[PDB]
């Protein structure tokens, strides 16, 4: 355990932080887009609900 | 084109959203901790600088 890092080690640590943060953004961004599709799914459910309600009220 | 999920499929998507969000929590939290150690490296470099200033001025 020597806390005196070396220039090369320091740069590693920094660039590794960069990478961690980038992964996090990448995960969040993929997650975000994901919800674009999940919503289209929820919406498809509605269309179907509406469909049956309509189908039900059109045959008295 | 057909966005109607089954019950099984829905549960999977919710469950996976949760997992993604936890992976995010986990990276962030580990990163938080890591910085705690990184700081000790910064601070150690400073104790070393004091040593040298001192060393220099005590041979002045």
């Amino acid at each position: 355990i020597d806390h005196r890092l070396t220039d090369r080690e320091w740069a590693e640590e920094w660039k590794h932080l960069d990478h961690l943060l980038n992964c996090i953004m990448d995960m969040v961004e993929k997650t975000r887009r994901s919800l674009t599709v999940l919503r289209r799914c929820q919406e498809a459910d509605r269309e179907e609900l509406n469909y049956w309600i309509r189908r039900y009220s059109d045959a008295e | 084109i057909d966005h109607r999920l089954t019950d099984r499929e829905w549960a999977e998507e919710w469950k996976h959203l949760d997992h993604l969000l936890n992976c995010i929590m986990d990276m962030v939290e580990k990163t938080r901790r890591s910085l705690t150690v990184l700081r000790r490296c910064q601070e150690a470099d400073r104790e070393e600088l004091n040593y040298w200033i001192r060393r220099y001025s005590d041979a002045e």
Binding site: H16 | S34, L35, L38, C41
Partner: peptide, 11 residues
């Protein structure tokens, strides 16, 4: 080197 640095976080 010490244990818990930003590297070491795998990923």
């Amino acid at each position: 080197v010490p244990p818990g640095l930003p590297s070491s976080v795998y990923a």
